[PDB]
Structure 1
Amino acid sequence: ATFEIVNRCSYTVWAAASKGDAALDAGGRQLNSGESWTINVEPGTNGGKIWARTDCYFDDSGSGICKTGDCGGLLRCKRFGRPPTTLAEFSLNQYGKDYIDISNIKGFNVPMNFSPTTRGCRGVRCAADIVGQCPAKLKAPGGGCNDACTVFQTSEYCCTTGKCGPTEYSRFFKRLCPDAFSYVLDKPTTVTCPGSSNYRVTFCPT
């Protein structure tokens, strides 16, 4: 499957793509404002994610640091990124269908649209100014809006036992972005697409 990753932000981002224990395609690349990077993701990839990283520095070897979304200091990510990260999440070719969503469970750094480029389903979007409107206690001093689990490390925020409810903090993310997951047990906003669909992830869609 193809994923065209498009940076519409006015700032550079370093795109990342991983399924947690491995890179997808090259795993990461710099995207200046306006640039597009097309990746190939193997059919059947389960639990893949794409995200933006901000304010990165990399040496000649591809080692360094990002202020949001850092994946072990690598340009080419092999693992998931450090919160806060808005997440485009997908599982492909799962009993004949693809499943896509956006999540704010690991916080928010960059606004996102995640849409099919092929027929048969709708896109999802989280494009509100979550960083600007972020509750004081959630603001990440390194940049972005943290989720409550990251900040407070409680069973209720992290849904550790599988029995958690919405919270004042999850309701903030849900109010700004109704079509993204706000907490682990949120009413799902996952979209079913035809198996083997192709996609575009656009940072800063509006």
Structure 2
Amino acid sequence: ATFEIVNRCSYTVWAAASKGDAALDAGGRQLNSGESWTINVEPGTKGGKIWARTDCYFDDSGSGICKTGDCGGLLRCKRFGRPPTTLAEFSLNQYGKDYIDISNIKGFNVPMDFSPTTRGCRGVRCAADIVGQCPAKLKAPGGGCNDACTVFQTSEYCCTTGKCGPTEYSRFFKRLCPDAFSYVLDKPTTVTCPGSSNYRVTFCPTA
């Protein structure tokens, strides 16, 4: 499957793509404002994620640090990134269907649109100013708006027992971005697409 990753933000982001135990394609790349990065993702990929990282510094060898979404200090992410990270999530070719969603379960750093470039389903978007509106206790100093599980590490926010409800914090994310997951047991906002669809992830879609 083809993913076009487009940075419409006025600032540079370092895109990342991983399935948790391996990079997807090159795994990461700098995207200046306006740049597009096309990656190929193996059919059948389960649990892939794409996110943006902000305020990164890397050396010759691709080692460094980012203020949001750092994946163990690598340019080319092999693992998932450190919150806060708005997440484009996808599982491809699952019994003939693709499943895509946007998630705020790991917080929010960059607004995002996640849309098919082929026929048969709709896209999803979280483009509200979540960082500007972020509750004081969830603000990340590096930038971004943390989720409550990351901040407070309770069974209720992290849904560790498999039973949990919405919270004042999850409702904040949900109020600004109804089409994104706001906590683990949120009513699913997953979109079902035809198997082997292609996609575009746009950072700052309303920029």
Place the TM-score, normalised by the shorter chain, in its bin: over 0.9
Find out whether 1:123 has 2:123 as its counterpart. Answer: yes
Poorly superposed stretches of 4+, deviation over 3 Å: none
C-alpha distance in structure 2 between counterparts of 1:32 and 1:131, whole Å: 21
C-alpha distance in structure 2 between counterparts of 1:73 and 1:141, whole Å: 18
State the partner residue of 2:6.
6
Find the residue that maps to 1:156 and give its secondary structure: helix
Deviations 1:99-144 (CA, angstroms, capped at 9, x unpaired): 0000000000000000000000000000000000000000001110
Find the residue that maps to 1:17 and give its secondary structure: strand
Deviation of the 1:25 alpha carbon? 0.1
Q: TM-score, normalised by structure 2?
A: 0.99
Deviation of the 1:68 alpha carbon? 0.1
Deviations 1:1-40 (CA, angstroms, capped at 9, x unpaired): 0000000000000000000000000000000000000000
For these two proteins, the number of residue pairs brought into alignment is 206
State the partner residue of 2:139.
139
Instruction: Provide structure 2 residue ranges, at least 5 long, that are not aligned to the other structure.
Output: none
Find the residue that maps to 2:142 and give its secondary structure: coil
Find out whether 1:150 has 2:144 as its counterpart. Answer: no
State the partner residue of 2:80.
80
Deviations 1:143-182 (CA, angstroms, capped at 9, x unpaired): 1000000000000000001000000000000000000000
% identical aligned pairs:
99
Find the residue that maps to 1:174 and give its secondary structure: helix
C-alpha distance in structure 2 between counterparts of 1:50 and 1:141, whole Å: 22
Find out whether 1:191 has 2:194 as its counterpart. Answer: no
C-alpha distance in structure 1 between counterparts of 2:161 and 2:26, whole Å: 35
C-alpha distance in structure 1 between counterparts of 2:142 and 2:191, whole Å: 32
